[PDB]
Amino acid sequence: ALKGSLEGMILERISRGETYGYEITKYLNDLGFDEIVEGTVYTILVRLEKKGLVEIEKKKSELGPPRKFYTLSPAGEEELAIFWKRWDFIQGKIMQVK
Amino acid sequence: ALKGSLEGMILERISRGETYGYEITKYLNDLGFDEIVEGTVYTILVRLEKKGLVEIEKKKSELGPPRKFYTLSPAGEEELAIFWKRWDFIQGKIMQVK
């Protein structure tokens, strides 16, 4: 019911500390959005790197494979800023409709 | 970005006075989505009649074709309330994230 917000919901989670595909997927699941799988998140996480909106600290393990840790870039700091202003707008309009 | 709410927003308009396809579509254009088309509204109306959520007063003219006037059935009343409760639900959670 909100796949549009998913791209900005993720940047929201990344805005409050270094995080990883799993932790971000779990946080979305905890919010009530249990329909999504790890993969769906990573496939947006890849997209956000391509577009330049996240920064990457690749972290190694002797216990398993390497995980990526995600941070907002200045561009992503900006793009998230826009996303919310977009939300505020639409809620506000619906509000006056009601 | 609101093509799914379009059905509920129309029921919202029908809730405050008897009304007709054009007035509905114009009200929509006044709300802001000027991507709307008179046609797009009528198809939804037609579906709403068939779902049993609106009531028809067909009104004639010697000036041109007849126009159906729409008002809410008791079911449409119920259905619109369900939609608002849903917006409330989703606005609340989004804003909690925010």
Numbering used by the authors:
A (entry chain B), B (entry chain A): 7 to 104
Describing publication, verbatim:
The LftR protein transcriptionally regulates the expression of the lmo0980 gene, which encodes a putative multidrug resistance transporter, LieAB (Listerial importer of ethidium bromide as artificial substrate), and facilitates the export of toxic chemicals from the cytoplasm to the extracellular space. LftR contains 108 residues and is expected to belong to the PadR-2 subfamily. As transcriptional regulators, PadR family members commonly contain a winged helix-turn-helix (wHTH) motif to interact with operator DNA.
As a first step in the understanding of LftR at a molecular level, LftRΔNtH and LftRCtH structures were determined and refined at 2.3 and 2.8 Å resolutions, respectively. The monomeric structures of LftRΔNtH and LftRCtH are mostly similar, but local structural differences are observed at the H0 helix and the β1 and β2 strands. Residues 4–8 form an α-helix (H0 helix) in the LftRΔNtH, whereas the corresponding region of LftRCtH adopts an extended coil structure, indicating the flexible nature of the LftR N-terminal residues. When the dimeric structures of LftRΔNtH and LftRCtH were superposed using the wHTH motifs of subunit A, the structures of subunit A were overlaid well, but those of subunit B were not superimposable due to severe positional displacements in the quaternary structures. As a result, the inter-wHTH distance of the LftRCtH dimer (~81 Å) is ~11 Å longer than that of the LftRΔNtH dimer (~70 Å). The cavity of the LftRCtH dimer structure (cavity surface, ~277 Å2; internal volume, ~148 Å3) is larger than the cavity of the LftRΔNtH dimer (cavity surface, ~157 Å2; internal volume, ~83 Å3) probably due to conformational changes in the dimerization residues. Noticeably, the comparative analysis of the LftRΔNtH and LftRCtH structures indicated that the cavity of LftR is flexible and can be modulated by intersubunit reorganization.
